[PDB]
Structure formats: C-alpha cells, structure tokens
Write a protein that binds this ligand. Structure first.
Ligand SMILES: [Cu+2]
Ligand SMILES: [Cu+2]
Lengths: 234, 233
C-alpha cells in the first residue's frame, strides 16, 4: 500500500467552504506558481457521501485518505475523448474496481480514467483531493485547471458551520450538467457509466503514482502558508 | 422467459404517482378471496429506478415490454428485516445484472436483494406486480403494503407533461418509511452492495412463478369486466 505522510491545506484569510451536491463538505483553495497550478480540498465525507463515477480531461487527481474507510471505484480502461460518453447507447459502460482505502493511502488517478467514491460506513471520514492542471487544460481564472471553479459554481457555500445548506434538485442536476464546462464527464446516477463493480483490484491501477508532482504542490502550499509571495493561493 | 401481457385494472380515476425513485406509476391494488396484490404500469425515465432493496411482505414480478431496463439481483437471501446487508448486519451483498429483453418476465421472491435502472437515454415501460406473501400483515387495500407505501411517500401526478418535483422529505421518506411497508430500502446505490457482476447465475435466471401471475391476471381481467367478487381501487 502506497501512503503519504501529510497533505497540508493552504490557509486562506477567507476560506471557501462548500457543501457539494455529492454530499461532501469541502474546504477548497486554488494555488499556482510559475510551473504549476492546482486545486486542493480538505473534505469530510458523511455516511453515503461521494461523487458518482466520472472522468477528468483537464486535471490529474490524487486522493489521500487519512483514516481509510473510503471506498473508491476505479477503471482499468481510459476514455481519452470527452465527446464520447461511456454510456450504453454509445461507446459503452466501464468495468470498475473497488479500493478499500487504508489510513494515509495515496491514490493517483490520471486524466481519462473513470473513478468515483463513497463512504460506505457510519463514520464521517476525512479525505484530501488534489487536482493538478494538466498540459491541455484551458486557462481558468485561478489557473488551476478548472476544478475549484466547478465546485464553486455547483455547490452552495457553507456560510453556517453548524447548519449545512439545503441541496436542491437543480443543484444535483447541475453537478452533472455543468461538469463538461470544467473538463469533467460526470454521471448523474451510479450505474450510468458502469457495467460492473469488482473487488479484485488489478495491479496496474494499484501501481499508479506520481509523488513528484504531489511533493511539488505540497512545497507550493507550505510556501504560501509561510507568506512566500512567489506563489499564490486564493 | 417471456410473458405476453399483463393488463392494468382500469380505475375510474387512475392513481398516477411519481415515485421518489423517479418512476412514473399508474398503480392500483386488487384483492379477491384467496389473493391480494398491487400492480403498476410504469414509465421509467433515463436514470430512473429504485436503489437496491429487499421485500418482506411481497413477491415481485417485473415485466419489460421493450426490454432495455437493467435489473440487479442477489443470489443471497436476507430473511430477517432487522438484519440489513451492511457491515454489522448481514454484510454488503453481491449483485448480478440482467439486461432485460422484450416481454421478459423476471420473478423476484421475497428476501432477495434487487433493484433496477433505465441506463438508456429514452423513457422505457415496465410493469410491476407485488403479491401479498405468506406472512404480510393486513393493509387497508389488503395488498401487502406496496401501493400504500408509494401513495404515502410520492406525489400524485397532476400533469404527465409537467411532472411534480420530488422534495427532499419525500426522498428521505422513501428510505426511512420503507420498513413500515416491509421493505429495507437503501438510500444510496452502493450502500448494500459489494460487487456487481454481469455473469448471471443460473439459480437467479431460473426463478419463476407463472401460476400466481396467471391468478392475478385473472383477477385484473375479471375486475375490468365488472365482476364484483374481486376489488380493484
Ligand atoms: Cu475526480
Ligand atoms: Cu422491489
């Protein structure tokens, strides 16, 4: 099992706290430096929370599970063309494999893979996501490859820490329907993109990693948190 | 395994309900001296259909006039309503998928975990029959509970072209109230689920009960002829 010791959060003066339509509590920020741009969210996942299967085109993603418990789903197949949805009528639905995450496990998911996750437990579980701008991403306002812009556009702001905002039908539908604008094909129901869910995890998925880029993004976050003005987080 | 037709009892004022599982239902309950059941002629929009659940009060038939609908079904049975298919209870379960064909009839006895979805981009028809089983308590329509369930949790459709919006309370109740009506209903798709496989076991493929369906069709047909020895409402 590939683990990672810590992924810190850039501490903004005005944190952006969002309750996603996938029932996830996000503290999210965008960072960039000369050589890199990304979004990062420190998240809490209540029981049953997590996104339906989806595929990214503008970012590579890391999942870090401090307490494990999170069940991730991941394809072996890649879907390199955003215009071809992995649906029954078209190119065809995908085979996914489940990962029973362990404490401080680091999962790397390159662009074009299908993935998702759920908290299948009764605990409210921590997870950190890092979404790094890839080499074909268009330039978004925060130069991050589009993911914070997506969550900010689709998820209500948590203005009251002790009362989570109401999620509406429109917000749930938008979570899927706005996603392509941010280089995401996001399914609206669990079985839309999915053919099978198997528990025997192929070693090729299991082996995927990119610590070098994660370590660079950690240097950026840590620098921002020390007041270094050569990087920006906002 | 196919079935030629399952007719709908024609009520003066059909009961049209949009379920919190995004199903458009034309539903009724019927009973006669020996038998009680609910039936719905449904249209399932893209992505519609219930998340995995298990029945305690009924045996269920699914009939897919145009196929298309994808069903999910366990081999394992869960005979104790107080033991959920979750860590700590019975354990999360293995499901097997069924890609339905035209006029296919799928029989699902009580205690099996099942569900379905319309995975296509067009609305599809399905007919449900839920037959009151050996142990079901007595509900007002004597049907084993299913019509009372849907009528309690889901809104009436006042206009098929302008479907009612489901509320958060309705969706919550579809899960939370289900055990009162003899259903353990999951609130997210993978709650009760370990794996989903496309290799359909023969022990599931062979499930059938044409004899009880034929009895229930006879009740419906009799009701539709005006026979007062049976009731549909
Ligand atoms: Cu993702
Ligand atoms: Cu059922």
């Amino acid at each position: 099992i590939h683990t990672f010791d810590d992924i810190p959060m850039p501490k903004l003066a005005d944190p952006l706290l969002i309750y996603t339509p996938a029932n996830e509590i996000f503290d999210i920020a965008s960072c960039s430096a000369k050589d890199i741009g990304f979004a990062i969210a420190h998240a809490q996942i209540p029981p049953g929370g997590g996104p339906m299967p989806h595929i990214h085109y503008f970012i590579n993603e890391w999942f870090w599970t401090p307490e494990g418990g999170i069940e991730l789903f991941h394809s072996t197949k890649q879907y390199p063309n955003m215009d071809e949805l992995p649906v029954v009528g078209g190119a065809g639905r995908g085979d996914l494999y489940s990962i029973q995450s362990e404490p401080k496990q680091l999962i790397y998911s390159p662009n074009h893979y299908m993935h998702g996750f759920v908290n299948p437990t009764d605990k409210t579980l921590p997870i950190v996501f890092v979404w790094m701008r890839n080499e074909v991403a268009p330039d978004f306002p925060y130069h991050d490859g589009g993911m914070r812009e997506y969550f900010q556009a689709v998820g209500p702001r948590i203005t009251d820490l002790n009362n989570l905002p109401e999620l509406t039908n429109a917000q749930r539908a938008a979570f899927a329907s706005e996603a392509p604008k941010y280089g995401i094909n996001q399914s609206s129901y669990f079985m839309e993109y999915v053919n099978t869910i198997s528990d025997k995890l192929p070693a090729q998925i299991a082996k995927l990693k990119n610590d070098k880029d994660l370590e660079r993004m950690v240097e950026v976050i840590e620098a921002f948190n020390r007041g270094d003005k050569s990087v920006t987080c906002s």
